[model samples]
Each structure stands twice: as structure tokens, then as C-alpha cells.
Target chain A: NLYFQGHMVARLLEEHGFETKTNVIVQGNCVEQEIDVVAERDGERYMIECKFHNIPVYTGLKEAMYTYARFLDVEKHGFTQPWIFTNTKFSEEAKKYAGCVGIKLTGWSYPEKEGIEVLLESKGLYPITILRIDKEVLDELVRAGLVFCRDVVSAGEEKLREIGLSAKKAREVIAEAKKVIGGS
Target chain B: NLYFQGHMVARLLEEHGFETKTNVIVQGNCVEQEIDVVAERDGERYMIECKFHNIPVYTGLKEAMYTYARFLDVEKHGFTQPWIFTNTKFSEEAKKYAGCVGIKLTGWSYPEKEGIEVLLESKGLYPITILRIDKEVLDELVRAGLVFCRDVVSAGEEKLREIGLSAKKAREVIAEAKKVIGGS
Candidate 1:
């Protein structure tokens, strides 16, 4: 469910904003040992840490401290702009330490975060998990990264078939999505 | 540093309670995934990983592949419980994976699972760095893999100073450790 949100974030940042990629796996000794990590957009390569959790929760402090540690390692190797994104607020110490270490924080009320939600709302980029359809339908749509009704609308009809949606129902979902986020 | 923490998790699971193997590499086409660490005791098995970062950003929502790959791993591999222990918060999407079957996440202190500090305390285990004697002493404790407060108490006076602490400070540090943990 959250992954779709990630996809939405990626799609918005990429198609709606900047060029981006996901599932970036880094291996070999060129940097800091063999590991499945890393990502970039435009020409800025970032050491990004993705923190998705249940919303309205207080994000813990350790996330910040450890990330700071990773920041040091990546610097000695190769990488820049280490960022931490969450869907919640950081604990007091977490926020404080991140500030001292230069680890960017993004989340609830974090860094004009309304813009994040606003950005999604503006793009009508909702995850497929919100759909009221068959489990199989939802799962398929999730695979297609169409978590929002608008994701169907934005993705177009071809996107429907990709998720194995019936043509009639696909139109129904897209129409519904258009209405849900319809106001301009 | 995170790699060390990753292995520390291995030690905790194994030495603290169950029998475990750290950094047990796996092979075969198990989708895009890596088994950082895993443990087993009384028929139950666990998979663990330690991830952290340092930089600065409002870490945005991210991809779901790393989350999904673990799911694929447990299913394909065998009857093993999956756990990801990171020094950061998880995205709501990444958090969603924990809601799925078999995938449990312990990051900073996001899920119900305690943070590493709490985990260590439960077993009366504290990182050697927790000692307040001197920075160099702490670094040496870590370098020597003297992870426990008791590790130093065992090292005794002469061994403590060998790591670059003054003899008097070493004695004080050990005395402090003795008071904190309370031992023979």
C-alpha cells in the first residue's frame, strides 16, 4: 500500500517534476562495499533514505542518528545530499540531531511538507490502495502503480489493460478518479 | 559503521537468546534481494538488516522493491521470519510491508520493536561507546569489539589504558561501568 505511495512520489517527482529512478541497487567496491542502495535525479545523485510508516505517528530519533552515520560513510566513498523522508513527525532529538548533521528531513509539517501533499493532490497522484474494487483488481492496479483513482485517469486506458482491468470498469474507475480530484 | 550495527543485530539475536549466523550469504535467483542477517532458535527463524544514512533532506516517499523483495525471499527461501532493522524511519509504504505477512520492520523505533538502545538494555548489553570516560576510549572499545560494559570490566585497568586512556581515567571508567551495570 505504501509502496504505491512511493511510486506516486516517484511519478510526481519524475513526470510531474524531475527525472528519477527507483529500486536503485548499488554493489561492488567502488564505494562502500557491496550493497543494494542509491538513486538520483537530474544530475544530483543523492544518498536517500526512505522512511514510510503509519501516519500521525511520532518518527523516532534513532533514524536520524544512524542516518548521520551513513552520511559520513557515503561521503568518504561517493554520494551527496543525504535526505530522509517520512510521512510523520520526527521526535525532538531526531529533529535536533538531523539539523546539526545536515541530514534533510521531510515529513508531516516538515520543510513545507504541505507542498508534498499539495503536490500529490495537484497531480491527482493517489495510490491504488484506496480503490474499492476486487482484491485482485487492487493488487493488479498497485502493480501498475495506479493506487489512486486519478492514477487510472492519469495513466489512461492502456494502463487499465496493463492491470487486467475490464474496459467498462476501467472507465468507471477513471471517471470516479477524475471526479474525486476533479476540482481544478 | 552501519555494517557493524548490522552484524551487531546478528550477535544480539544469536548470543542474546537464539542461535544465529550473521552475514550468511544466499544464492539463486531470489528476485532482487540480499539476506543481510538471519537467526533461528526453537524452530523460529529471523531475517535482519541494519540501514542508516547521513545527509539532509526531507526523505520523500520511496520505492517498494526492497520491501517486496524480502517478501519474495521468505516465501522462496523457507520458513523464516523476516525482520529489517535500520537506523532510520520507514516510509508509510515501507511500513505497509510490515502489515503484510512475515515482514517485520524495526527501524529506529518506528514499529513496536524497541530501538537498538532499548534492545541492548533488555539484555543488559550496552555499546562500549556508551561509556562516558573519553572519546578515544569509546572508539577503542568499539574497535576492539568490546561491545559490552562488562567487556571493559573484564579488560581490567591495564587493558583499558592500552586503548589510549590515561590510567586514572581508565580506572574511573571501569568503576563507572561497574556502578552502571552492577557486577562482581
Candidate 2:
């Protein structure tokens, strides 16, 4: 889920003005650092950490604390802005610690009106799994890295047909794709 | 198998005119890259490709081509010599490509005078797995990242004591380690 959520963030970056790269190993003066999401704009590199938790609740600052440690390691290169996006909320202490350290933290409504759902709504960028399509069709779309509403439409009729959808069914998929991004 | 084989190579680099680093990931102009083994000497970097196929097969140009591509990318940043260390023989096309591209190729016995086994013998840098120690002792050494005879000797009895080996038993491990690397 974190991966798919990360992909959503990557997709949205393009809609804004950032170029996206993933799984980057940043060579440092003392060691090599692996970063999850990297976005670049106007020569500034933005690094993001996405925390996906299936936990019923949170017991500690799992995401924020480690992210800060890794951020400091990569920050020595002098190009990364440590930012995090999480499906679950950060612990109260985590928010304060992150704030003190200048790490930006966002969660599912933890910081009020600023989280992934907020961003998704702002960009009309719902992950396609939300669509009311057949489970098989949703599976096919996701398998090919097409998770956003617009990804299916942009994949076009030929690609849909290639996924084994019939000629007319391909048209229906795109029509539904166009509807989902708009109806909400 | 590729894991400890790499440590064997890492140990030999120290004797063969190089200082070593493993798994170096550096940020490229637009991407991040992963290097399997990195060795440095006299201002030049050595980017190594380690292919450990348990005897009885042949591998083609896949490892060489991709390693060369990665080297050229890394070479753009500075001085890097692309070298591939493999346990098997190379493909005909791989040898031709290595000659043209300057990727120093050394398989089981490629360069006649200088190859994997030859260099290991010259430096007495055999892996700890080659020693006739208790499998349990060998396992502990490997688990703690001590793969070579010198690694155990360099770690000394104190560290191996933490690995559950007695001072007396640890001495035995090093003594046996000494015997293998001396000539095998």
C-alpha cells in the first residue's frame, strides 16, 4: 500500500512541476544512502518518505524518528529536503520532534486539513482502485503500473485491448476513467 | 553464494593495490545508481561486477554489458576502471566486447597470468569457508561479516568471543584460517 501510495505521489509530482525518481542511492562522503522518493525542480531536490501502516493504531513515532536520522545522513550532501507522507498519523511527540528538526510531516488528517486525501482531492488524483470497475479489470490496471484515474485513459484503447479487454470494453474503461477523475 | 564470494573479492583488493567499499549508491545527474563492489587506488576507482555461478554452466554478455553501461555512467563522474570477476568462463562475444570496451575481464582463468584463483593464491586471501573449522564457527564468522583468514585474525579473540567462540576456540579458528590461505 505504501508503494502504491508512493506511486500516486510520484504521478502527482509530474502534474505539478517536479521530475520524479525512485529508489535512489545517494553516495555520501562516508556512506551510501538509499532514498525512497526523489523530486527535482529548479535544481532543488526534494526527498519524501511514505509510511503505509495497516496497524489498527500507532504506538510510537516509527516513521518520523527514523526518517529524520536518514534525512540527516543524506542531508550532508546538501540537496535534500526531508519530507514524509503517511497514511497513519504521527505520534504527538513525533510531530514536535519533527517540527524541531525541520522535517516536514503530513498524515491522514493528523495535521488537520493537510494530508494525502487532501492532496488527492486537490489534484483530482484518486488511485484507480477506488473505481467501481470489475475486480479483474482493476487488477489488470494495477499490474501494469496504472493506478491513477487518468492512467487508464491515457493508456488508450489499444493498451486496454492488449490487457484482454474487448474493443468496446476498452472504450468503456476509458470512459469510466474519465468519469472517476471528474465525478468527485 | 554471491554474498561471501564478494567478501572474498573485497579482501583481495586490499592486497592487490586497492582500498574497498561495497554497494556504493551515488546520485547521478538525474538518477541513482547501485554499484556492487567499489575499490579505490591512487586516484582511480574500480567498479567491479561479481558473478558467482556454482560450477557447471555458462553465462553470456548480460553481466558484462550492464556492468560496462554502469561503469561508463560512473566513469563520467571520474576515474573508474570497469572490471568483472566471475567464477565461470566467459562467452566468446563477452571477451571480444571486453577487449574493445576496456572492461578488464577475469574469470576462473581468463588472463592466464592474472585471474581470480591466481590472485587469491598470490595473496593467500582465501575465504573463511575454505578453512576446516567447525561449520558452526564458520557460520558465526560469516554472520558477523568476517569472511577471510585475516578478517578473523584482525577481529581477534575479543569479537569472536561475542560470536560465542571461546578464546581458545577462536584461536583455533584463526590458526586453521591461517593454514588455508597460506597455500590453498
Candidate 3:
């Protein structure tokens, strides 16, 4: 579930014109690092970490510090900014620390105009988890690069079948996606 | 596990000359509350909240706030201090907030002279879980007010037999406690 959010984050960055890599491992000067997303555009690179929570938890200063620490360890390799992207809001202290240290922050209803909610709504990039698809089918779709509701919708039944979902299951997925997307 | 910690906290307070009641409900002026333990001594009363974690987690400021909030709601009922007792340590922020607000904090290593570890060791009050006793036997012992390893050691075989432990199992618990306590 978290990995799919990481993919969705990468896709969102791509939509906003940043070339992004998901789950990239890099050698830090001090330690090895597995960054969630490494995004780049116009000579600037970002170490973007994604956190997904099914519960209403506020990502705290601890996580922000961890994200910043990773960025620091690998900064000599040219990562420009540290970012925390989450499906939930950051705690007040987390936001304060991020603001002080120039860590980019994005989460539900935060950063107002460009929060995760806004970005998802603007790009119609609702994640597959939003649908009631079977767990195995969802994993298959995500692996097939259809990580969003719109992806499932546009891929149609044919592409889904090619991806190994049965014809009946594919139709069911498409119907679920269409119902969620509110279009035929 | 948390409830067992609650019982242990009550027992420890009792050992320290505080008369303690475990799991008491009080009707606050503003709310209904279930305080983990209410302890009183020398005309002072305390609301003690016990947090037990198998993992190494720092009880944080959020917990301090929760404990203090309950104290506030029930202070009129004669509880003079809010206290947090845990097997693990408290986060720095938790300690800071607790100190500022007069909330008593006791856990691993903090409050140097009287931490949970110090109390447990000084009185040999190790919990029954420390022994290699079966889960059902441990539950039975706890229900029999033999919550600590030392309790089983002192209670001995005849009392344990009276409390329904098999003669063989009774000897097993006694041996485990003596081994842990390093005494015959």
C-alpha cells in the first residue's frame, strides 16, 4: 500500500513536469540510503519521502528530521531539497522545523493551494486503494503501471486482460473505476 | 499487557508507601474518566497513568497532555498530580511538558533516583512475564494477586497449590522465580 503511494507520488511529480524515480537506492557519503522518490527538473533535484497512513495521524517532527537526515547524508551527491509528502497532515512542530530547514512539505489540506488533496483532485490522480478492488487484482494493476483510478479507467478491459485480470474481473474493475471517477 | 502494567504500577505505588487503587472510575465535573491508578499519601493524591510497550517507544508529549487533561477534569475530586508511569522512557518533550505542568514522570532512567527500573530492582518486583511460565499460569497468578516474580517466590508451593496450580507447575514457577532472583 505504501509502495503504491510512492508510485503515485512519482506520477504526480511527473505530471507537474519533474522527472522522478521511485524507490532509488543511493550511496550516501556517510551511509547507504533508499529514498522514496528522487525528483529532478531544471537542474534541481529533490529527495522526496512519501508517508501513507490509513489512520488520521499527523506525521511528526521525528519523520521530518529523518527525511532531512537522509538528504544531508546524500547532499554531496546533488540532491537539492528534502521533501515529505504524505496522505495526512504534518504536526505543527514538523511544519516549523521544515520551514526553518527548507524541507519541502506536502500533505492533505496543507500548503493550501498545492497540498496532496489538491494535486490529486487537479490531476485526477486518485490512487487504486480508493476503489474496492480485490487485493491481488489491485497489486497486478499497480505492477502493470495502472496505479490510479483513471489509469484503470483508460486502460479499459482489453489492457486489463492483457495484464492477466480475467475478462469478468477486468469489467468489474473498470466499472468500479468509472463509478469512482464519475464518468462512463 | 498494558493492563498488567497498570496492576504493576499500582503495586509499586503501594510498596512506596502510597495507598493505591487500580483502575478506578471517577465522575469529573466536566467528564467521566477511567484513571489507571489513584494513589494517595501524606495528604497528597495522584492520578497515575501506566503505559506498557514491548517495543522501545518513548512515551511522548501527546500522552503527557492526555494524562494532564484527565487530571484537570478531575482535580476538583482531590487528585493533586498527574503522573505517567511506563516501563520504557519518556521523550524529551514529554519530560519538558510534564515538568512545566507539575505532571509527575517516572519511567526508565529518568527521575534518576527513583525510576521504574530502580524501583523494580530495589524491591525485586519483576513482573510474572519475566518468568518462563505458561500464559494461562501467568494469568492465573496475576488473578491470584501474584503479579510479580517475587510474589510467586514468597507465595511458595503450598499457596500456589491452594490457588489451583498443579503441584509440578507450582514447583516450576517457584524455581523460575528463584533462578531469576539468583537465590535458593
Candidate 4:
């Protein structure tokens, strides 16, 4: 089940604009293997490592990024940068380690919420638009509009749920309709 | 079938490190209707039109790029670049037109062969690595060595094909190997 969660993350990232290469091999049999959802632009690679557990753990992010980086180096992948994405918060120790290694880390809290908002905004819409739209348009429209906002938010929430978003994220998107809209 | 081809093209571009948005709506029902793959990288949007057919037609590339560019201008999509990818060849006229409009047009044949060779060379092997292994592991095994390469190539090919590489891609890989390994 946990392994399946990583696949789902890879699937979603692939569905989006990310160029994902999953289950890359690192060193020996003792290699650090991880599912890598990678996006490369101008020679820089953006990587996301998904962890789906009932209780979120920030350590997953650190381990995943570190392992992925080591794999890239061993394989001579030649990437400019690396990123870590998780559905759980980072432990203080993990966060410090990530900083030491120069890996950017994001979690299922405000960072996740903010990321959704950024993606939605990039797609063109605010949360308020979703509530103000007519039902017919909401049902039929595919591009940006109130209905589109709702769809993005709903899809985003479902993704987070599947990844087991932190309690903070759950509340942030659940409580106010306006917040979800704005968040996306 | 064309729809699927477009989707396949979009998927391929995403694999190549492009930030793409597919099925983008341009204007009204006309959809300004560019096909599936459109990518944006480094502030430049490359509207990609994919054509799959018996033979390469010069007009195919020209028209696809022309229409995509016009769509961008008409709909104010503000794209920085446009491209066309085809399974067929381009006519001299089409090539001229593409140059005139500054659209990048590439025939899949040459680029694919080039890609495979690049993949092979990066592993420090000549193209002969193709004959040394099974078709599936040609690229991967060349890079990782035989034992590990088999698994790597098999898995990579499965993933690549899932994302939309044609059987002809194998042939292209072979052809590249021949050129590098002194076959033909």
C-alpha cells in the first residue's frame, strides 16, 4: 500500500508538466532507491519524492532527496538542481540535514497549500471565482472559471488525501470555501 | 487517432524536460484547436503539433506551426516559440515556410536516431552496444553495463513505451548503432 502511494504520486506528476522517471537505481544492492518525479527545464531538474503513510513523516523527504541525488551522481545523470516534496512535515533533524545538503524540501502543510494556490494561479483563477460561478457553467466549463477552480481544488484535495496531507493542510482546505479557492 | 498522437507527443515532450500544458483552449468552440502537446520553458512557450501519417508532408509541419502561432496571437496566449513534430518528412516549401516564420520543425526520424546515440555515448560506449544486448536494453545496458543494463533498459523501455515511443524507435536505435559500430 505504501509503495502504491509512490506510484500515484508519480502518476499525478506525470499527468501534470513534470517529466517523471521513477524507481531509479543508485549504488550497489545496498543502493538507495526511490521513485523520482522529475521535471527538467534549462538543464535543472525538479524532483519530488512522495510518501503516503497514515502518519506523515518528514524524514521521508530527506531520505528520498538524498537517495535520489546519490543515484543521479552515481548514474551520471548531470542535473543542475534537486527538490524534495512530501505529504508529511520534516523533522527538525531532517530539515537541518536537508539544508546542509542544499536540498529544497516541502511538506503537506502551508507549503503544500501554497503550492496548490500557485499552480491554480498559474492556470488562471482565484478561489472566490468558484463559489460565484453559475452551476451550469460550473458543470460544463473545462478551462478557467469558477467551476474550474472547484475542480482544481477538489482534485488537489483528493491528491493530498491520497498522500495523507498533514492535519494543518486538511483543516486549511476544509474549513472555508473561500480559503480553498484562494489557496488554489 | 490524431488525438492519441497529440497526447503521445505531449507525453514525449514532458519526458524531455519541457513544462507542458495540453488541450489548451484558445478561443471559442473553434478551440483554435491546437493538438495535445504545448510546452513552456524558460519563459518561452513552444506550441507543438504532432502529425502521424503514412508519409511526411512538408505542409504538415508548416500548417501545424502556422496554425498554432496564429492561435497564440489570436487568443493572446503569448507564446514565445512554436514547433511541429511529425512521423513523416517535410517538403522543401514547408521547410522554407517554417524558417520564414521562425518555427522549429523536426522530423522524428533523425531526432530519434540522434537521441538514442546520445543516450549510448553518454554511457561511454560506441553504438555497437546495440548488438551486444537485446533490443530493449540497448541504451540502458550500454550506460550501466550488461547485467544491470538489461534490467534498466527493460524497465526504461516499458516506461518509455507507456509514455508513447513507437516500435520504430527500436529500429532507429539499431540504425544509430549500425552507423556508430560500422554496420552500414
TM-score of chain B, candidates 1 onward in order? 0.64, 0.78, 0.90, 0.52
lDDT of 2 by residue, B95-168 (tens): 76567657788887778978888887676666777776776777778768798788887888889999899888
DockQ versus reference, model 2: 0.02
Winning model by lDDT: 3
The Cα local distance difference test for each model comes to: 0.60, 0.71, 0.81, 0.47
Per-residue lDDT over B104-162 for candidate 3, one digit per residue giving the tens place of the 0 to 100 score: 99987779989988888787567788888777787778767788878998898999998
Give lDDT tens digits, candidate 1, residues B54-151: 64321221222333334343445663766777666766745543454345666666556576656776677765555675555666665666667787
Q: Is the docking of candidate 1 incorrect, acceptable, medium or high quality?
A: incorrect
Question: Which consecutive 10 residues in model 2 chain A have the weakest lDDT in total?
Answer: A57-66
Determine which window of 10 residues in candidate 3 chain B has minimal summed lDDT.
Answer: B61-70
For model 3, chain A alone compared with the true chain A gives a TM-score of: 0.93
Q: Candidate 2 — which pairs collide?
A: none
TM-score for each predicted model, relative to the true structure: 0.44, 0.45, 0.53, 0.30
lDDT for predicted candidate 1 compared with the true structure = 0.60
For candidate 4, the per-residue lDDT at A161 reads 47
Clashing pairs in 4: A58-A89, A117-A183, A117-A184, A127-A181, B56-B88, B56-B89, B58-B91
lDDT measured at residue A170 in model 2 versus the true structure, 0 to 100? 85
Residue B24's lDDT in candidate 1: 59
A76-153 per-residue lDDT for model 1 (tens digits): 456666677676677776676566557777774577645356666655555555556777777677676665666677
